[PDB]
Amino acid sequence: SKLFITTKKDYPITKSFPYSLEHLQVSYCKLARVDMRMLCLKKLQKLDLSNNHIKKLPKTIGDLVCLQELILNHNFLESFEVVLCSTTLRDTLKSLDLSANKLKALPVQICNFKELVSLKLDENELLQLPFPIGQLSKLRFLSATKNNLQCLPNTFKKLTLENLDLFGNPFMQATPLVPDIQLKIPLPLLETAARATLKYRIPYGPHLIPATLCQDLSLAKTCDCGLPCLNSFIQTIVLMNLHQVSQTVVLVDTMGGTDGPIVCYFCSLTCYSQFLDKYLQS
Amino acid sequence: DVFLMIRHHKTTIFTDAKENTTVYELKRIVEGILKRPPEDQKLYKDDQLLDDNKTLGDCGFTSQTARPQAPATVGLAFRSSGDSFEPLRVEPFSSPP
Amino acid sequence: SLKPRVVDFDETWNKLLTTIKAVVMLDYVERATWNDRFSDIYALCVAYPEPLGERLYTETKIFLENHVQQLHTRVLDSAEQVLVMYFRYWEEYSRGADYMDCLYRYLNTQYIKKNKLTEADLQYGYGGVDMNEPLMEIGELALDLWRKLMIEPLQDTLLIMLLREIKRDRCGEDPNQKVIHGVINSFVHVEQYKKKFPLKFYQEIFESPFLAETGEYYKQEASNLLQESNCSQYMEKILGRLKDEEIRCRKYLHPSSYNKVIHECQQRMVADHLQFLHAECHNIIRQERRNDMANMYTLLRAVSSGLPHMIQELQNHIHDEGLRAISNLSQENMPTQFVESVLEVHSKFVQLVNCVLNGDQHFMSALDKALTCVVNYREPKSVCKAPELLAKYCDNMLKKSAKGMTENEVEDKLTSFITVFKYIDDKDVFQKFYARMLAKRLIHGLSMSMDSEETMINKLKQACGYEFTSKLHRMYTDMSVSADLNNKFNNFIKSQDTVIDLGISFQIYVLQAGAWPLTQAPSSTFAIPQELEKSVQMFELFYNQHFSGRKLTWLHYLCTGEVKMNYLCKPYVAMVTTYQMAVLLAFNNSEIITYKELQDSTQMNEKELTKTIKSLLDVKMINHDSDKEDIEGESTFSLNMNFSSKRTKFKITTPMQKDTPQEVEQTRSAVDEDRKMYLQAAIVRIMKARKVLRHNALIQEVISQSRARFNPSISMIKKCIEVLIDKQYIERSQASADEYSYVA
Amino acid sequence: KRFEVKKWNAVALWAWDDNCAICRNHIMDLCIECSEECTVAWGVCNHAFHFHCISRWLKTRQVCPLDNREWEFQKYVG
Amino acid sequence: DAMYVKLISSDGHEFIVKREHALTSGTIKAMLSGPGQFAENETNEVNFREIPSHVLSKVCMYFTYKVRYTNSSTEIPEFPIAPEIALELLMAANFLDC
Ligand SMILES: [Zn+2]
Ligand SMILES: [Zn+2]
Ligand SMILES: [Zn+2]
Ligand SMILES: [Zn+2]
């Protein structure tokens, strides 16, 4: 049911693995690329390829049907392939660890991976977490330590977690009183139709809306007042307590301080003054 | 200030007018756009004929009613051969799903 | 209808390619077809499940590559016309590229600008994130493929053509401006989509080779010009060439190179031969060479080292001209001739600088230095005589001898004089000499009007501050109050309880001591004539009652009066001095009076008494009873029985003459003493400022702070140093003999 | 006697009531440091000095250098 | 019509709107600034053959709303979009870039 490969000699160069296995682990091997053969196996639940020389992940999953916990930490991955995100892997994944990897920007399509319950991205070079991380409502374990997370994304407040390891990152100082005015009045229509489409919960899809827009609306921002705004927003890097997001928070050299940056978006300039009044009173 | 959507047959003209604007100004605008003499046509408002002398203020073209974001409909009807004018055959805007 | 729909690539792309070929190679096309192509491009860009954005991009790039290759081959096939044909196809293709950018607006905006996403910019994925052969805008891509496939394969061919025509322009021929300019700015135009260094391609293709070729051509031109002609028309031709070259640079090149070219054009025929020009400008400025001087200035102001040699040469010329002008003055009129010669030199050279050398500040500084050296020109083993000359000039202009001379030209000459006076290094000597001569003018009343001295004091105050002439002004104020006190005295004459008759038309001048340059004769013990003691005593009590804690001294070498002779057959008005008045008062008592009686009566000493007697006998008012040719102690005198004078209303007072030489050395000794005190005070001031300062710093500070009035010799500065040291105000530093410290 | 004088243009010089031993300047003249408040001071030792000079001298030395005797301000003339 | 731009939709409706109102959408700006060398006979017909007329009406009304309520400090109200018409306008806004 279980097997482990820890050296080049123990790794079958030509012959394939048996089928009685349930868990597969490959560690400390000079695998330049993930083999085509290992993608043809039937019942892999947990797949580990720790400490290898893998640069590019396979384009498409060959035949895997469960692939519950895929672990690829301590690897040489640069960026996930876009086509790999769109396969059936989202329907059954449970975990994904990319610790100690040269990954620099998680692709946004990882929002479609709704089935994760534990994510690990430690010791990476992640500029910021994927913006629609709110879509991962089932996620429970998140770790991106030793990264450069200048600002967590807006949807981060949606997730409910148990622990959150994030100490060791450059946290930009909050600037609630200094906005970055990207808003334009009159709201060009596309922000206005767009604000409308989402307001009316008009089911749409790429077969009905031209594809590029179909991307923009999928990840359209949500202002604090409760209405979407595809563009023409006010961005404020505001610190919020992270105990609401996760039950337990771990930080470094800070006792009693758990604040974290969040890029709050604002639909309209008049809507910003309400938040300023709220912050001044609080 | 009010904005007007003149609807003649298969045509629609967007104009700007004030509550004190005279109807002859609208008639001259239509003259310029459609290169036809002004006295031919008569503007309309829901089958209620509108005359030249009186201005739009007494019609009902208030700011709260005819906004730029949703102009009020004003009919139009040109001149046939002689002294006969066509009725208000205003083509409605196609049905959205 | 607007909808994501399946689209066959070939059916739309045939019409799209037809329109694109129509627009890139500008020909007739319908507006409706343009609208339909917008619709077709939108339909291709978005579809389901097969987007055609990538395929459309690749196919339009391939078509652009093929078109640029076809144009390149067509241009290569026709030689000796590469420039004209290249420019024609260039303008056609560039406008076509703009038209594609407009027509592919959706492609550029929502396909290309969404794949070029490098970092985690809120949009990772959703496009061709894996970027090899990076995507570029169609308007940008067309020009990029134009430079890659039409410019570079032709680079070496273009320049050899371009440099052939531009050089042909410089040889007197007239190539067409439009084609050359278009080809040249094509290199800038192509890289117009580059964020960094848009001109880098232009610089590397047609700036550095062009700069080098210009350098070589103008080096050869300068060599030919030097070999064929002399200096003057060499500057003429260089100026003509530089003007024509700026014209050509604006005519052909990019504006950003406008400076660079001329930098390589003047440095090859001016800076490479500034030795030739500098070795000839000396003969230019020292002669009537106006246009040559202007051309020299224009040439040498461009290069770095052109100016200072000309500046120094002009300073030398001005200094020599001033020395030659002020060394040939006639003995009669040293002051006015000196001032007018200095003003003539100054005016001529200021006109030269403002009319030929554009009034450059450096040339003004050179003029000022040269005239400063000329003004303070002192003969060997002699002291500077300029301050004396200026004081004499001012006095003469303020003297009554200038008959029929109004005051407006007085002001004109008097404000011209300030230009010369500003060049005086030793202003203290002039100040003291003018103080003495102005005091003489005021006492003797030989001025135009008092507004003239208004102007003098005001001008000198403007030139050297208020403290420079403050004492003078104080002296001036005495005048302004003296008459008042006189009138005030008259009031007291009408205010005394016991009215008395003075028997004299008493007039006085009340002068403040110290501020006036008048020296009292030590212990003259002159006996006042019996008449004047009343006036003296009432004036003293007047002054004591109106001024408290003040004493008044009566100087008798300037007080004068009048004696009238009526009772004899010869009525004569005689303006007389105090001593002479006392002498005549004595002689009126007895017909024959001996010298011992003069001592008994006048009580004033032998030297001044015999001077008065000599003055009296000079105009022959009294007779000598002794045949001795010398006035001894036994001489006896009598009044003249037979006296006459053509001037009936005459004066026996000695006229005020120039200051005797003895007087000028006492004045200079006083000036030197004042200089020593001023340097002492300045040294004390600086020591208070620092309390620690290097001796050289003391020297620099004192020379800087004292040059406004006089230029002290450094030797006098040393003597001031040990004078202060002996006063126990400062100490010589134990660790450093050249350092001073405060212990006072 | 019968002969008299009809005019007399006198000239007079007025000053205070000669060279300082401190500032080496004329007593009636202005001192080195000075500005119109520089009056003069007469002491018991029959010495007249500038007010500023004697004031700055007495700040450390309380004796008159001329006679090596303590200086006492007899009066001030201003 | 060199000052009044005329837009012909799929149904044949001719919506005549101010040219400065039409230039709000950059696509139309390119549409008019296409081939060039226009005769300037006061005839600007831009056949939007592939968009419905009932949505081109809202597009023109938005053009007027945007040009009128730009550079204004008044309380600008939300442009009304019917639920049955939002998408056609969105895709149309996409094709119009406005
Ligand atoms: Zn809001
Ligand atoms: Zn003082
Ligand atoms: Zn004493
Ligand atoms: Zn003193």
Coordinates of C-alpha atoms in Angstrom, one line a residue, chain C residues 504-505 507-513 520 531 543 549-553 559-562 567 585 588-589 677, chain D residues 1-17 22-25 32 56-57 77-78:
Chain C
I504 CA 31.8 145.6 16.3
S505 CA 29.9 143.7 13.7
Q507 CA 30.3 137.2 13.3
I508 CA 31.4 133.8 14.5
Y509 CA 31.8 130.2 13.3
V510 CA 31.2 127.5 15.9
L511 CA 33.3 124.4 15.0
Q512 CA 33.4 121.0 16.8
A513 CA 36.9 120.0 17.7
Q520 CA 45.9 124.8 17.2
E531 CA 38.1 145.8 21.9
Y543 CA 27.8 129.4 25.4
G549 CA 30.1 121.0 30.5
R550 CA 31.7 122.4 27.4
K551 CA 34.8 124.6 26.8
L552 CA 35.5 126.8 23.8
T553 CA 38.9 127.6 22.3
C559 CA 39.8 135.1 12.5
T560 CA 39.7 138.2 10.3
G561 CA 38.1 141.6 10.3
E562 CA 37.9 145.0 8.6
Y567 CA 40.0 160.6 8.5
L585 CA 45.9 148.9 16.7
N588 CA 47.9 153.7 15.9
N589 CA 48.9 154.8 19.4
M677 CA 45.1 102.4 14.8
Chain D
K1 CA 41.2 156.3 19.8
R2 CA 39.5 157.7 16.7
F3 CA 40.3 154.7 14.4
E4 CA 38.2 151.7 15.1
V5 CA 37.2 148.3 13.7
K6 CA 33.9 147.7 11.9
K7 CA 33.9 143.9 11.2
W8 CA 35.3 140.8 12.9
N9 CA 34.7 137.3 11.6
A10 CA 35.7 135.2 14.6
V11 CA 36.3 131.5 14.4
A12 CA 35.8 129.3 17.5
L13 CA 36.3 125.6 18.3
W14 CA 34.1 123.8 20.9
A15 CA 34.9 120.5 22.6
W16 CA 34.3 118.5 25.8
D17 CA 35.5 119.8 29.2
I22 CA 43.5 102.0 27.1
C23 CA 42.2 102.5 23.6
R24 CA 45.1 104.8 22.6
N25 CA 42.6 107.3 21.2
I32 CA 37.7 101.5 19.5
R56 CA 35.9 96.8 30.0
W57 CA 39.2 97.4 32.0
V77 CA 30.5 113.7 31.7
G78 CA 28.2 113.0 28.9

